[PDB]
Homo-oligomer: A and B are copies of this chain.
């Protein structure tokens, strides 16, 4: 029972702004959301290089504590490593973390929920949705 996979962009936006049209779904789709451990590796980096690393760390650990964090595992790697070769066959480059996100979200049948709908366009056999 798992349905959505927040892109790193989404988590940043939600951490920074704490919107009200964000709080919308989180309450509805609680116990269906999660993030790739990759997205966690980005968040920790950003808190750690920030001027308030213990406040910014402290908000994150609350953020991900209310999600589930899925481990980048062997199926997620194979899948990324296939779709990464497709993007090469057709010249479309995507950043290395967001395709690892892509190759994870794909391997399990989840909808990556991002706000960068304009280059989450192309990654073969993806299922985006735009909570912003």
A-side residues, CB < 8 A to B, are: 1, 3, 28-29, 32, 37-38, 40-45, 47-49, 53-54, 57, 61, 69, 71-82, 84-86, 88-89, 96-97, 100, 103, 106-109, 111, 124-127
Contact = CB atoms under 8 A, between A and B. Distances in A.
Contacts of A57: 32
Interface of A is mostly: helix
A78 B125 contact: no
How many copies are assembled?
4
A128 B37 CA distance: 24
Contact of A109 (B71, B85, B125): B125
Given A49-B85, A109-B106, A76 B37 contact: yes
Contacts of A44: 77-78, 80-82, 85
Nearest to A54: B28
B125 A111 contact: yes
Given A29-B54, A45-B80, 16 more contacts: A1-B61, A3-B82, A41-B76, A41-B100, A42-B81, A44-B85, A45-B81, A69-B73, A69-B77, A71-B71, A71-B73, A96-B97, A107-B108, A109-B109, A125-B126, A125-B127
